[PDB]
Swiss-Prot record:
Annotated GO biological process: DNA recombination; DNA repair; SOS response
Disruption outcome: Not essential in the absence of DNA damage, its deletion renders cells much more sensitive to DNA damaging agents such as UV light, ionizing radiation, alkylating agents and DNA gyrase inhibitors and desiccation-induced DSBs. 5-fold decrease in survival, loss of HR, no change in NHEJ (non-homologous end-joining) or single-strand annealing DSB repair.
Entry binding sites for phosphate: S71, S72, G73, K74, T75, Q190
Gene symbol of the encoding locus: recA
Organism ancestry: Bacteria, Bacillati, Actinomycetota, Actinomycetes, Mycobacteriales
Keywords, ordered alphabetically: ATP-binding, Cytoplasm, DNA damage, DNA recombination, DNA repair, DNA-binding, Nucleotide-binding, SOS response
Gene Ontology MF, one: ATP-dependent DNA damage sensor activity
SUPFAM superfamilies for this protein: P-loop containing nucleoside triphosphate hydrolases (SSF52540), RecA protein, C-terminal domain (SSF54752)
Organism: Mycolicibacterium smegmatis (strain ATCC 700084 / mc(2)155) (Mycobacterium smegmatis)
Function: Required for homologous recombination (HR) and the bypass of mutagenic DNA lesions (double strand breaks, DSB) by the SOS response. Can catalyze the hydrolysis of ATP in the presence of single-stranded DNA, the ATP-dependent uptake of single-stranded DNA by duplex DNA, and the ATP-dependent hybridization of homologous single-stranded DNAs. Numerous X-ray crystals have been resolved under different conditions which indicate the flexibility of the protein, essential to its function.
Binding positions (ATP): S71, S72, G73, K74, T75, T76, D102, P103, E104, Y105
Keyword Secreted: no
Name of the protein described by the UniProt record: Protein RecA
Length: 331
């Protein structure tokens, strides 16, 4: 080389060059790197968690894990990422093992329940089997499994080692057909190790979702402020964070997102009372501005785009900005 010399950057690039080469893309990155923008992606439904994932949504053909304490926001997230998939006329499966979906809450989010394949597995060696067997076909686009913690091994539900081995296997047999089909998988996880102590490594994306404040300002408490930290992202630098709202019954607050998200970058101003926009006003009081966007889809689609144009993302317009070495630029 030239050791007892300097750290000059030329050589190090060959390393990575090869590491990404032997272990595949994503094996080594610089946290604040330039992200590789793809074409196919499933928007999560919250602009915030989107750019947080850095690519616009969730990656395809990759397994994603969503763990977190009860009633935090996982399923929704799932349920939304599920609806959007369908917006591109896709087939989405759902493996029930918790027996807790309310097809009508799904209904208000976007889900075309009547098209949604919902299996209710007899045991653990079935939700994984029907999963893969439903996966190897390749007609789907996104398959969801409710709780990695309730997939008890055939043996157990009758008459040690099992669950982790169960996951370890099928998830090895499956991580292989999902990539060769672009079928993205979501594995909800109810944290409160052995089961997902494979999924952990098998996964590409791993979202951590926790409830924060109980959205307060009127009728009683209408929503909940969810934070989400992407502790593992083998498709873009990791450790990013996005916070967002999910109104009871309403779902993840898109509009609400666009505001905090739209000011946190300079497209939307002042706002003592008043949240103005490029000259005109969107209203006084967040909820109100929240109202004006959900009453003016047009203005709403102008702030989601504009923003997705200042930070990459695979899309619609921007058309010139993107390339030639290193930089997020401020916080
Ligand atoms: N079926 C429903 N009908 C009406 N509101 C709902 C329904 N289901 C969930 N919610 C609301 C209340 C909560 O604030 C929020 C939680 O999102 P959710 O996706 O259910 O979280 P989660 O699935 O990660 O947690 P849990 O562990 O409780 O299953 O959505
Ligand atoms: N709570 C939030 N904090 C920061 N960014 C957020 C948040 N919620 C959503 N976003 C979106 C909005 C921002 O325009 C974008 C992230 O800002 P960004 O400056 O690009 O941070 P980053 O690249 O410097 O930080 P990190 O060091 O954590 O890797 O993501
Ligand atoms: Mg961060």
């Amino acid at each position: 080389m030239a050791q007892q010399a300097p750290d000059r950057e030329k050589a190090l690039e060959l390393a990575m060059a090869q590491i990404d080469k032997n272990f595949g893309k994503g094996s080594v990155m610089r946290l604040g790197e330039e992200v590789r923008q793809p074409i196919s992606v499933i928007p999560t439904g919250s602009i915030s968690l989107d750019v947080a994932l850095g690519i616009g949504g969730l990656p395809r053909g990759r397994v994603i894990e969503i763990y977190g304490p009860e009633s935090s926001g996982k399923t929704t997230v799932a349920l939304h990422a599920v609806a959007n998939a369908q917006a591109a006329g896709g087939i989405a499966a759902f493996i029930d093992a918790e027996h807790a979906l309310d097809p009508e809450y799904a209904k208000k989010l976007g889900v075309d329940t009547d098209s949604l394949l919902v299996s209710q597995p007899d045991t653990g060696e079935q939700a994984l089997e029907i999963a893969d067997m439903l996966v190897r076909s390749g007609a789907l686009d996104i398959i969801v499994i409710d709780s990695v913690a309730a997939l008890v091994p055939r043996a157990e539900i009758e008459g040690v080692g099992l669950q982790a081995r169960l996951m370890s296997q099928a998830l090895r047999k499956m991580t292989g057909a999902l990539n060769n089909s672009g079928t993205t998988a979501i594995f909800i996880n109810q944290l409160r190790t052995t089961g997902g102590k494979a999924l952990k490594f098998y996964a590409s994306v791993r979202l951590d979702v926790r409830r924060i404040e109980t959205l307060k300002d009127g009728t009683d408490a209408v929503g909940n402020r969810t934070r989400v930290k992407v502790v593992k992202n083998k498709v873009s630098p990791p450790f990013k964070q996005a916070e967002f709202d999910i109104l009871y019954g309403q779902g993840i607050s898109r509009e609400g997102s666009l505001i905090d998200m739209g000011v946190e970058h300079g497209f939307i101003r002042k706002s003592g009372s008043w949240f103005t926009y490029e000259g005109e006003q969107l209203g006084q009081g967040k909820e109100n501005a929240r109202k004006f966007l959900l009453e003016n889809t047009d203005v709403a689609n102008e702030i989601e785009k504009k923003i997705k144009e200042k930070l990459g993302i695979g899309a619609v317009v921007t058309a010139e900005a993107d390339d030639v070495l290193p930089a997020p630029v401020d916080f």
